[PDB]
Amino acid sequence: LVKNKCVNFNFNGLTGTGVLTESNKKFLPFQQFGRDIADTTDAVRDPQTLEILDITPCSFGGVSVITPGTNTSNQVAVLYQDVNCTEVPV
Amino acid sequence: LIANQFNSAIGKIQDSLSSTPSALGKLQDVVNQNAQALNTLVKQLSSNF
């Protein structure tokens, strides 16, 4: 298992995709994997060692080019919307 | 007297807004409508069509 790194995962046939992190929520002993309001998985109990892992989607967002007029200049800026710079270079 | 009426009326706004859960029903309706729209959009992914 890999934490804090965006990795394809498959738990008992979940076949999801996203980064898995350590979670605080406590499942009941029989409760296999979590869910959200919109019926999208947002947690999973690790089957080997019984711990709850909060899964979150791989970071995505529009990339916009803040540029002045091409007649004024050719130097541009880039915005990576709703993402932290640590994973920007990827 | 006008100043007292105005201030007490403002206190009435505060009390009515706090006590009545339907004071902000318009903006809350807008937010709930957007939430229902997005939730239905997500649920449409679960649909076979």
Partner: peptide, 22 residues
């Protein structure tokens, strides 16, 4: 007044603090 399947929300340009200041 009171996760992502490809759906993104964008922040208002005038944040809540600047809206309140306006």
């Amino acid at each position: 007044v009171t996760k992502f399947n490809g759906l993104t929300v964008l922040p208002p340009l005038l944040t809540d603090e600047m809206i309140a200041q306006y």
